[PDB]
Write a protein that binds this ligand. Structure first.
Ligand code: FAD
Ligand code: HQO
Ligand code: OAA
Ligand code: SF4
Ligand code: F3S
Ligand code: FES
Ligand code: K
Lengths: 130, 243, 577, 119
């Protein structure tokens, strides 16, 4: 019989608390929560919008809390962290050759942020100047 | 002159005596040139002849060196004591069963690498007709992904592999991607089943630590994401083939 | 011992072993091939080669020019019929590697590029950036994964071969993880174990290039040919001995002394060439031996720079430029940064000559076969008679696939016509190996194997280096003999079974001592100067084709003595003069 | 050792959704949270831009219906996909987790669809 006794170290549910690189990963996926929470909020607003001004005002009242204002500010932060990390990661899915050389990610990261900026401006214009 | 000394902690384990791994500590002379691999030889030569570990090239090209240094997967021959004056603890490469001291069972890695058919498939050209024509532009498509030295540090870095020992892993998928992306190969379909498995690219949540530790800058993470894109194109094609 | 049946057993999975395994699987699809190695195949030393591998490719070249380069580079000690076969099959094997995927560097039109190495007038070295060994070895390893005939015994340490009535019948190996002995029966065994550069204190080799295969052959009456010719590479890093490819100079790097002087102009390799344009044959691209000898001469004059790791000269590459450096010397740069802490863009790299390649090895005929029927040797552990007294740069890697293929095929045939042997005799051989192993394990004496290791290394460096004298060679022969006596007083204090490396390094050390004595004795008797073997004593400082245009054969008898015999060199079209 | 004929995973369907959703909430989520979660409730807008009548006028337009749907739904298919996998990362056993998180997505998607064809 073998004299070998392979020792398998166990992996705990707290593995990610160790290294910062893992923590930041957890944090990144964590943005998922405020994001769905915001989708839920929009659904409230959408159905308050349909139930007449009376209900709509009750929605706006909710958004005024102001504990809900904090949660929403946290939500905005989370969303930006998502945008920040999403843009760095997306370029890796493409393998593009520009003159005998594999390029990116910088050219792509720059374009996405350019588009967000323009989008943030066009939406704000459209929703407030008229 | 007078060489400084460093107390290194090495996690020993003898399956014929120990019930579990346990630390030992050794005083090792050193300078600005001393590497972990240099330190381990000094220990085996003067302090504990029963210290076992893998190594060979001494120049970070063979890949047999991997181990944990303060919980970071690294190559002992590319790790230097001058950087660990406040403490250095050495352990066997994470996520692999420990066999004895710093040696771990690499069988899963080997089988994983074998399962993706890492060889040119389906090209009928024969030696007498000369070599294939391939341009810098075509080679650039896979070149970076061919620098893998099978050292396994990416398997130690991946938390997904530690949670799912059946995951074929970062290097294996990168290797598969390297052949899929080579204009001379025609055997992408022979590799997809494994990349489409749940134990394939889909077991990856893009933690990205593998790329961060590659001593050869292969960027296995980029390979996997790209694999996901191909696995997805494959899934559609299959869904649309009522043929 | 558990036994295993195979048509052929290959000891060694580097370039040669792998190319041999594939040839054998393609020559006989039904064969059961046992590929053995003490490290996983991809960790073999082939992985480290950086310059390239030779093969006639340009239109203005000729098989005759590669033929002549090899013969002259070997100072006429090459078996001219083998050299001919070699050059003629290089193109086929480099191309075939390409078919298997090897990513050789290319010309913009997609044809493979080629550069100059070993001083060849017409460039013909194919290359994968400056990671050629890495790419050849992996391509080879990975390609072999598709042949089910090849059954690998990874991390199996072959202890001995089994011989009876002049024919090989298998081998005994140790499953390293398990610590158990195993018997592999085969009628053909190919030795592809590598060189012996680790008997030198400072070298460019991996820890596993210990000369095991050579030692095993010595034990069975097979001689080692031309062992006195040890190739030094002129540019290695102090202490680690790590190699800095000749490619640093083919790209215009310079070698200077403590005065910043390009000393090579005063040793017959002038006139100086402008930083811009380096010329083959001149200055830093001068004859390999003259460049290493210049170092020793500089050292005598006190022109080397003293450092903590030893005296060196400087390999200055700054004037190369980022683009060039990173496009043709990415590896060299990271090695330099990591092990000597130097940026080849900002500072000069400290270097000095280092033991690098073993020319001599297991004696074989033109088909890689040895004097024991069924036993072959290919690759760096052998002597097919290709390199003479000095290997030509980029000929070794070519050799691995050209003769590895030959070995695989010839062994295949040999095992098919072998016929059976005396079973009790064979089994007795196996019981023999096992007993000798217990003997070594039970040996006591309190001697530390590692210090013997260190002394052997120092001896080879002092007595069998760049310049040799009968006083110092003799001193080395005396040292090794002493170290052989001590080896018997070594105690392997680790009696564990799971990956016991203490025991393995101790066996490896045994082969080294044996192998090193053949080198020192071979060198002490060659009362001439030829190729890598250069002597400073009166009446020995020159080449002597009248009395030494012959090969050295070194045998080891059962009484531990090293005896020499001499053989003739096959000439075909290029007589010496 | 390793299954020679593994079952093709269905992840490419959720991954794809999650991909489009992750890209949509990367580009458009920040501004929307600004307007709705902050500017709206704080009166920080000119005149009657974000007044009931104006929002309703917008939500009832075609482009507004499509926009509200996608703004609500794409992010959901992204976030639920991540919470699904977070469960595994955290080693939290969730029975029929694939049906739970993706079902919730589908339920909420339907609920939203009803909403933009109007209540
Ligand atoms: C740093 C460096 C760079 C070089 N660059 C070049 C170059 O650019 N061009 C060129 O032409 N040449 C070059 N060379 C020389 C050439 O690379 C080598 O001569 C060649 O690679 C040797 O290959 P090999 O097949 O004989 O075996 P190796 O690659 O040395 O492998 C030997 C095999 O035998 C196995 N083995 C050994 N002993 C045992 C045992 N006891 N039991 C079981 N298995 C065993 C090992 O595990 C291994 O698998 C270089 C050499 C070095 C050191
Ligand atoms: C085309 C853009 C794709 C970029 C997506 C980012 C990669 C990515 C990031 C994640 O957090 C994941 C978590 C679970 C499963 C898959 C994941 N993927 O693929
Ligand atoms: O070292 C190099 O780059 C080339 C050389 O001489 C060899 O063939 O080993
Ligand atoms: S990808 Fe990088 S880390 Fe992973 S095995 Fe290959 S070389 Fe090592
Ligand atoms: S760390 Fe693991 S999760 Fe994917 S990005 Fe690398 S394989
Ligand atoms: S010894 Fe080769 S990778 Fe470290
Ligand atoms: K040799």
């Amino acid at each position: 019989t073998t004299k070998r006794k392979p020792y398998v170290r166990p992996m705990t549910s707290t593995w990610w608390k160790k290294l910062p690189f893992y923590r930041f990963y957890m944090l990144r996926e964590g943005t998922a929560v405020p994001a769905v929470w915001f989708s839920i909020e929009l659904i409230f607003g959408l159905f308050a919008l349909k139930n007449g001004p009376e209900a709509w005002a009750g929605f706006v009242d909710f958004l005024q809390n102001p504990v809900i204002v904090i949660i929403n500010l946290i939500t905005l932060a989370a969303a930006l962290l998502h945008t920040k990390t999403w843009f760095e990661l997306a370029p890796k899915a493409a393998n593009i050759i520009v003159k005998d050389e594999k390029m990116g990610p910088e050219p792509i990261i720059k374009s996405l942020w350019a588009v967000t900026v323009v989008a943030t401006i066009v939406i704000l214009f459209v929703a407030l100047y008229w | 002159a007078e060489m400084k000394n460093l107390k290194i902690e090495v996690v020993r384990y003898n399956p014929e005596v120990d019930t579990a791994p346990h630390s030992a500590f050794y005083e090792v002379p050193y300078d600005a040139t001393t590497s972990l691999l240099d330190a381990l030889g000094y220990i085996k030569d003067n302090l504990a002849p029963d210290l076992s570990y893998r190594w060979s090239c001494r120049m970070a090209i063979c890949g047999s060196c991997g181990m944990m240094v303060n919980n970071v997967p690294k190559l002992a021959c590319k790790t230097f004591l001058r950087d660990y004056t406040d403490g250095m603890k050495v352990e066997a490469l994470a996520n692999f069963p420990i066999e004895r001291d710093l040696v771990v069972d690499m069988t899963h890695f080997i089988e994983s690498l074998e399962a993706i058919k890492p060889y040119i498939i389906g090209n009928s050209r024969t030696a007498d007709q000369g070599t294939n024509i391939q341009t810098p532009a075509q080679m650039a498509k896979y070149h970076q992904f061919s620098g893998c030295i099978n050292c396994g540090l990416c398997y130690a870095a991946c938390p997904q592999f530690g949670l799912n020992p059946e995951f074929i892993g970062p290097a294996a998928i990168t290797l598969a991607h390297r052949y899929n992306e080579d204009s001379r190969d025609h055997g992408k379909k022979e590799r997809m089943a494994q990349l489409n498995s749940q134990n394939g690219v889909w077991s990856c949540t893009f933690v990205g630590y593998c790329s961060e530790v590659c001593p050869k800058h292969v960027d296995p993470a980029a390979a996997i994401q790209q694999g996901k894109v191909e696995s997805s194109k494959d899934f559609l094609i299959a869904t649309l083939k009522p043929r | 011992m558990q036994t295993f049946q195979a048509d052929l057993a290959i000891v060694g999975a580097g370039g040669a072993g792998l190319r041999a395994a594939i040839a054998a699987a393609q020559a006989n699809p039904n064969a059961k091939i046992a590929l053995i190695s003490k490290v996983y195949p991809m960790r073999s030393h082939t992985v480290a080669a950086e310059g390239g591998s030779a093969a006639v490719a340009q239109d203005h070249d000729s098989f005759e020019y590669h033929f002549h380069d090899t013969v002259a580079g070997g100072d006429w000690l090459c078996e001219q019929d083998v050299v001919d076969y070699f050059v003629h099959h290089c193109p086929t094997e480099m191309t075939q590697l390409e078919l298997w995927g090897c990513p050789w560097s290319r010309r913009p039109d997609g044809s493979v590029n080629v550069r100059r190495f070993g001083g060849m007038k017409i460039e013909r070295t194919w290359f994968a950036a400056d990671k050629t060994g890495f790419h050849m070895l992996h391509t080879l390893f990975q390609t072999s994964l598709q042949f089910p005939q090849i059954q690998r015994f990874d991390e199996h340490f072959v202890l001995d071969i089994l011989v009876d009535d002049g024919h090989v019948r298998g081998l005994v190996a140790m499953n390293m993880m398990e610590g158990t002995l195993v018997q592999i029966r085969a009628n053909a065994v190919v030795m592809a174990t590598g060189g012996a550069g680790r008997v030198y204190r400072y070298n460019t080799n991996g820890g596993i290039v210990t000369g095991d295969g050579m030692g095993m052959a010595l034990s069975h009456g097979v001689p080692l040919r031309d062992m006195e010719f040890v190739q030094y590479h002129p540019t290695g890093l102090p202490g680690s001995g790590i190699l800095m490819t000749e490619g640093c100079r083919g790209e215009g790097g310079i070698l200077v002394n403590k005065n910043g002087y390009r000393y090579l102009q005063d040793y017959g390799m002038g006139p100086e060439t402008p930083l811009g344009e380096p010329k083959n044959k001149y200055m830093e691209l001068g004859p390999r031996d003259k460049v290493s000898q210049a170092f020793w001469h500089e050292w005598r004059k006190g022109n080397t720079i003293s450092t903590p790791r030893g005296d060196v000269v400087y390999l200055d590459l700054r004037h190369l430029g980022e683009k060039k450096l990173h496009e043709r010397l990415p590896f060299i740069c990271e090695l330099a940064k990591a092990y000597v802490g130097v940026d080849p863009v900002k500072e000069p790299i400290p270097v000095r000559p280092t033991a690098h390649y073993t020319m001599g090895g297991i004696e074989t005929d033109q088909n890689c076969e040895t004097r024991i029927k069924g036993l072959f040797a290919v690759g760096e552990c052998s002597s097919v008679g290709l390199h003479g007294a000095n290997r030509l740069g980029s000929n070794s890697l070519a050799e691995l696939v050209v003769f590895g293929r030959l070995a695989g095929e010839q062994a295949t045939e040999r095992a098919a016509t072998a016929g059976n042997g005396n079973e009790a005799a064979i089994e007795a051989q196996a019981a023999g190996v096992e007993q000798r192993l217990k003997d070594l394990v039970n040996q006591d004496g309190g001697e530390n194997w590692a210090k013997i290791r260190d002394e052997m290394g120092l001896a080879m460096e002092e007595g069998c280096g760049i310049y040799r004298t009968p006083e110092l060679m003799q001193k080395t022969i005396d040292k090794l003999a002493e170290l052989q006596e001590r080896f018997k007083r070594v105690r392997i204090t680790d009696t564990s079974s799971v990956f016991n490396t203490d025991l393995l390094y101790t066996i490896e050390l045994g082969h080294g001592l044996n192998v090193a004595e053949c080198m020192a004795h071979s060198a002490m008797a060659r009362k001439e100067s030829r190729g890598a073997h250069q002597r400073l004593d009166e009446g020995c400082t020159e080449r002597d084709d009248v009395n030494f245009l012959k090969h050295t054969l070194a045998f080891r008898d059962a009484d531990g003595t090293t005896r020499l015999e001499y053989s003739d060199v096959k000439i075909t079209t290029l007589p010496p003069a | 050792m390793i299954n020679p004929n593994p079952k093709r995973s269905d992840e490419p369907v959720f991954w794809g959704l999650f991909g489009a959703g992750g890209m949509w909430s990367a580009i458009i989520a920040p501004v929307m949270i600004l307007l709705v979660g902050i500017l709206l409730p704080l009166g920080l807008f000119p005149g009657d831009a974000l007044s009931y009548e104006r929002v309703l006028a917008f939500a009832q337009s075609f482009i507004g219906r499509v926009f509200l749907f996608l703004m609500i739904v794409l992010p959901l298919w992204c976030g639920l996909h991540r919470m699904h996998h977070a469960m595994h990362d955290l080693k939290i056993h969730v029975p029929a987790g694939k049906w739970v998180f993706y079902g919730l997505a589908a339920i909420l998607t339907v609920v939203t669809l009803i909403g933009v064809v109007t209540i």
